[PDB]
Amino acid sequence: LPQNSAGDSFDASAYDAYIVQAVRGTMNTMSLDDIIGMHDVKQVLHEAVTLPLLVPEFFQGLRSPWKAMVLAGPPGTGKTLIARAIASESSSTFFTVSSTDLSSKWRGDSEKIVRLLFELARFYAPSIIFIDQIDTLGGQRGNSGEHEASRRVKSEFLVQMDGSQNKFDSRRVFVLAATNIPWELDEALRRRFEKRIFIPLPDIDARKKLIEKSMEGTPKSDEINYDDLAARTEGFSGADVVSLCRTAAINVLRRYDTKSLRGGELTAAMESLKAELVRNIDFEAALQAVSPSAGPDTMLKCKEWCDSFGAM
Amino acid sequence: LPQNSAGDSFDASAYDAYIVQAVRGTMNTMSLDDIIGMHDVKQVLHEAVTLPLLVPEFFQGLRSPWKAMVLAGPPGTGKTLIARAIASESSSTFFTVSSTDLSSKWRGDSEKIVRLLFELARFYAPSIIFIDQIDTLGGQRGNSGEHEASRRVKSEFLVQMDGQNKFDSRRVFVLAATNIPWELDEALRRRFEKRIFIPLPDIDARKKLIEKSMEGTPKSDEINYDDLAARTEGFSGADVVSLCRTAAINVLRRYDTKSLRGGELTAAMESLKAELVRNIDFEAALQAVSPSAGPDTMLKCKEWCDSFGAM
Amino acid sequence: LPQNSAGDSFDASAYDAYIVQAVRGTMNTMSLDDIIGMHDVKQVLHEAVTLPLLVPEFFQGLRSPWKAMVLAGPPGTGKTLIARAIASESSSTFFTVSSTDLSSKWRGDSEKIVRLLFELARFYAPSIIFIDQIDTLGGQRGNSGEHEASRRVKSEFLVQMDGNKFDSRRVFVLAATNIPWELDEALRRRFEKRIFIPLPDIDARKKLIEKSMEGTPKSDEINYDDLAARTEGFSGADVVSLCRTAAINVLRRYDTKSLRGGELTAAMESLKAELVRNIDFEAALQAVSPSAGPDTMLKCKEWCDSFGAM
Amino acid sequence: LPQNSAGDSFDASAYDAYIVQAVRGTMENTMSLDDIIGMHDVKQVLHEAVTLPLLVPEFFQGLRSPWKAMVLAGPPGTGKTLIARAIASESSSTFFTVSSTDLSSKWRGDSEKIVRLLFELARFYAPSIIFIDQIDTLGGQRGNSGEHEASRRVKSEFLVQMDRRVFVLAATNIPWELDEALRRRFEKRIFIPLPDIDARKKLIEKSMEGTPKSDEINYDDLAARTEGFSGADVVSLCRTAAINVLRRYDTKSLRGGELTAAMESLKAELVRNIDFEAALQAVSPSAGPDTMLKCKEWCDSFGAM
């Protein structure tokens, strides 16, 4: 294992080798202005990571920095992008853990993996841990027919997430998790997550800025009204608009006949095809040919959940 | 784990000795214009894996290649053939996954296999992964009797499939094949851009199938293809070929070739190589095997692709 | 290993290295007057740990001191705080063992670490063992998906915790859970105190707010009686979250997302003295909801009102 | 280590000392072959299997080769170690008693040496019988749930090792857990039934030969009131009847004083008929009709009776 700041070291003797390897295997040029919308989550990340890095003498006592956040939303919007954005625009080390890192064949190895992960993230830096797809780890705790090992993992998260019984040693940790199904988390894990936030499907102006964002670098015409393109995609997610943009970018290639031109007269026409601009007809043909990943029941259930038990 | 292009080698020090054998066990020719009809899948495959091979300089930035496709439809309609065709037509490595290979005994000995497979497919040449019958692997997550060994495969697919995106090592294209497309997730179908439904029947293409299959050197008087193509009602893409095999065995079964051993074997065999087939054994084959296909599956798939299909 | 009182020493020769290391790994100055309410468990701790040091000639025969106590209630009411307070106020040695320090991949360690734990806790001092979240450790024995190598741990607790008329050394066993009806029917008999902990009512949350807000400058616009009257059904942790989010809302009154570096370190000193007015609570009361609706609380109340030993 | 008949000597200089100590430790009360109630067929096959070649060794030359392996299957308490101990008494063969704790083998590749040295030592003493009790242990599947990569080697060494004559007996309570290559290799698979209403009368009238019975001669009635007793329990019924003769006179109150002639007044007391009525209301059979029918179905699907 590498050393940390101020030349210290970790004495990892009491664990076996492959546990250390399996946690060691879970360790730029983006920006936090590349996230359209989401003001409050940017506010919490502003006042929980970037502000204690500058002025730590303000955040002590009752104004302790937060130690929890869970993002609950429908599965289209950007919940992974915000985590990678905060991973790039920081100076703190990042730990991504998915549901297949906490897995082994022997008995009682998941627990020691979680223990080693939390101690290492405490040792290295004021770090940040991203446990994506949290619902595959913490379900309920007394449901019908869960194995006798996942319940120990839930117990380990519960006993480790609060702690640091010494009032000193303000070595900060900030745990971040994203899920689709927030009505299936155990209650003793749910109150450990302060700042449970809802994320919506984007509004009109968010979609307008999305199409403004996605179409840069590629030349477009000057007859494109973005307003009708906003007003017709009522119900699209934040992930289908980029797919619509990609289909409207490749429809100009499907408009000409390159499937017929085989081998010959292929490399000679591709050099002048790159300058052909993108007109309104490609957007109309892509818009007729792309339908959203619909089913608005799930957005309804998730928003009613986070309006009942949520804390912004 | 032999090798790859440019003489490099893999370092699989992280896994056991039985897991890597299960993925190594998952790795003839065919022609592209054998597959008749279905121009849309040809379009998507041509703008997906064909044109990025010769011209990598056009596909950069916004013009990134695709990474997913789903073929919905009735069973036995030519999906494995398109898989083999796009395998052999290019210089790509070809993996194949069913539901019967992602199963082992120990808990957590299935999830390393999927991550190992995806690490190999990024490690090798630009490749094609054919995951067949995902209606059993991916159900719904919030089911009633969903095991605690089935959710983690879905979670591993969702985390691995969309992976940290700047100019990757090689493109990898995953296919799909499913008879029941309404029973799929809401987070897995989003990773599958370009979902498309393909139908079974035709009249003129079934005629072209007969003209591409009935390669019998006899039967110069069995040219009844209008009625033979009008009698293909509800017959899937395998049904006409099985009918042709039935007719070609009923050539030597309509004539008494039973118990011709010792007496009159070679002359009865050599006067039969030019023996004229007619509508007799064809009529025997017509009323022998009825199609076991129901229209409810086709109607519900055509209803499902109407709402949530991005052609 | 450490020494003990009177300079003796344990003889761990029949055990391997990592066993005594893993029990070695489980071995400020807050007072007990920070806990709001909860008189009954304070009474039992007073007459069970505090008093047998002062007058030891009293607790002699039928008045033998207690041996076990399970706290049960809805999550987030103050269970681990009483344990840490008793650890910091007494003079005993303190073991915090939880259900991850009892497992190893070898055969025969899940039952030995428990025995070495109890033998060291008897060897040292009038000690206190604090097993946290025992619902994972002790389930029902005759159950469906029970692995074999947990029955050894259940039998080891079930034998060890009641063992002549000699050996006047004391060990007190404290345990907390929030699903008590999944305890085995033979392990609930060992725990002879099964108190229930309630949610705070309308006379306790006022005192909890008044304890939590001292140390930060405030105004006198605040009506604590209304703030207790609207915050109904909350946890303790939600009350502390409310009292924190009010101050962070006071940070949000100065829009600091625009400024970056230029006199920013000198900007917050104008904010570091600002008062906390009533609009801050009037925003935080709709900013925060409770943690979980009442369905576990009624199950624990119907459980401890039939099988509970107050 | 002793010699054998005709002064031959085994050259056991090729192994360690604790191995030969273990296999010698696995090597007299004369019981009777007619001291067991029921089961005439197994007595017939034992008579053909070990006694008849001693008398007439010319009959067993060609196609009449004597049997070489055998297994009894049935419920617990039908006396499957009783036939083994009886035939160990009333024979001239050198008996052996192997077990699963006799194959502990803390090292690696040492159980294999123990089994091979056992079978080579068995071919030294010429008439030999090997008695493997409860072959369920070491007799699981070769790809089962709980197995190392070492016990499979034990099973394979046992299968090749079985090829100067010996004869192996064995028994189980759970027959269906057995293998296939181990099952086909054993030539004779025999079910053992529970005693019927006729054998029980002989069993209870035979066991009660020391104590004086007077008039409880309704042995047909005593065999009719016990429906499904499991053989090893009616002896417990007679034992409980004797202790019920003891319990009638209150002797828990006497402490030393005159407690020696008080037993002399009870050492001459006879077993009356009141003891059996209090004896039937205090003993129930150990099993329900569950394992017996399963053993019957397994012996009907594989038993060459």
């Binding site: 090992a149 | 605690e148 | 190598a149 | 090292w107």
Partner: peptide
């Protein structure tokens, strides 16, 4: 010499 240890695995 060579010795032998024992393991414990779980399965579903």
């Amino acid at each position: 010499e060579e010795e032998e240890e024992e393991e414990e695995e779980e399965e579903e």
